[PDB]
Structures are given as C-alpha cells and as structure tokens.
Amino acid sequence: TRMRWTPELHERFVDAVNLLGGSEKATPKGVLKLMKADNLTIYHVKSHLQKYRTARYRP
Amino acid sequence: TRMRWTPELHERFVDAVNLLGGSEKATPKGVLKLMKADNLTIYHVKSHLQKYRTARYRP
DNA sequence: GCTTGAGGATATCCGA
DNA sequence: CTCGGATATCCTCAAG
C-alpha cells in the first residue's frame, strides 16, 4: 500500500495546518487529530508536512 | 546500504551543479558524472538534488 | 522490447 | 513515542 494525496485531502490537511498556526508551528500528531481521516497514519502526515514546509524559505 | 552526505562532498556537488547552470538546469547523470566521486550512484545524487532544488534549500 | 534517466511524490531511516 | 531532518524508494513518463 502506497497512499496518494487527492486535492481534497490536501485541502483538509492545509486547513488543519492553518488551525495550528502555520506550517512551522504545526506538528504531525496535531494535523492528524484535526483531519479525522480513515486509513491515515501519523507517517502519511509526517512526510506530507515535511514536503509542505520546504515550499517556503524564511530568513 | 545508506549513504551519508559529507560537507566537502556536498561542496563538490555544489561546485558541479554550478558548472551546469545551477540547480534547475543541472541533471543527476550530469552532475554525478561531473563529481567523479567513487562509491556514488545516480540515485544518491538525484535524491540530494531534489532536496537542493526546493524553495527552502536553493540559496 | 529493453535499458536508462528525469521530475516529482511518497516512504523509510537517524538521532535527539 | 514524537519530532525534525536526511536520505532512499516508487510512479509516470519519456529517451535511446
């Protein structure tokens, strides 16, 4: 099994990230708890969030 | 097997990527091929280059 | 049909 | 068990 990130899951994810105060303050366990998605592990979120954090470079 | 990216090995990589017009134009075959380090695959090099091309790491 | 390489997405590993 | 980071594997789509 290899998951992939439909756009609706991505939006749910980014809503969770935003509720936790941004990509930098959010952590996987939080994002997962908020998303409430079946068949989804902390590792799915961990990897996806690492990708998300590397779209913006802050000084 | 798991590689481990030394800092001066990373230098050689940067050196090479710069010989090839930077992170965007540079290619894994090309830069592996320019680095001439032994015990170094194309696969090591593409994973590293993917990390370097991101908006976070390219400066 | 092989055998490659490319970019991007996703998973697995390391050390704290 | 969690986190952040580093590194490898997978997929799709090419080329030769």
Numbering used by the authors:
A (entry chain B), B (entry chain A): 247 to 305
What does the paper say about this structure?
Phosphate (Pi) starvation response (PHR) transcription factors play key roles in plant Pi homeostasis maintenance. They are negatively regulated by stand-alone SPX proteins, cellular receptors for inositol pyrophosphate (PP-InsP) nutrient messengers. Under Pi starvation, rice (Oryza sativa) PHR2 (OsPHR2) binds to a cis-element (P1BS) in the promoter of various PSI genes and up-regulates their transcription, thus optimizing rice Pi acquisition and utilisation. Our results reveal that the SPX2 senses PP-InsPs to inactivate PHR2 by establishing severe steric clashes with the PHR2 MYB domain, preventing DNA binding, and by disrupting oligomerisation of the PHR2 CC domain, attenuating promoter binding.
To gain insights into how rice SPX2 reduces the DNA binding ability of PHR2, we determined the structure of the PHR2 MYB domain in complex with P1BS motif at 2.7 Å resolution. It turns out that two MYB molecules are coordinated into the major groove of the imperfect palindromic DNA mainly through helices α3. The P1BS recognition by MYB is mediated by the interaction between the residues K292, S293 and Q296 in MYB and the nucleotides G7, A9, A11, G4′, A6′ and A8′ in P1BS. Electrophoretic mobility shift assay (EMSA) results revealed that alanine substitution of theses residues attenuated the DNA binding ability of PHR2, and the charge reversal mutation of K292 abolished this interaction. The structure of rice MYB/P1BS complex is consistent with classical binding models, and is similar to the reported structure of the Arabidopsis PHR1 (AtPHR1) MYB in complex with P1BS. Superposing the two complex structures using the MYB domains as a reference, the position of SPX2 molecules heavily overlapped with the DNA position in the MYB/DNA complex, indicating that the binding of InsP6-bound SPX2 to PHR2 would produce severe steric clashes and thus preventing DNA binding. It has been previously established that the CC domain of PHRs enables oligomerisation of the transcription factor critical for DNA binding. In line with this, EMSA results showed that the DNA binding ability of PHR2MYB-CC is stronger than PHRMYB.
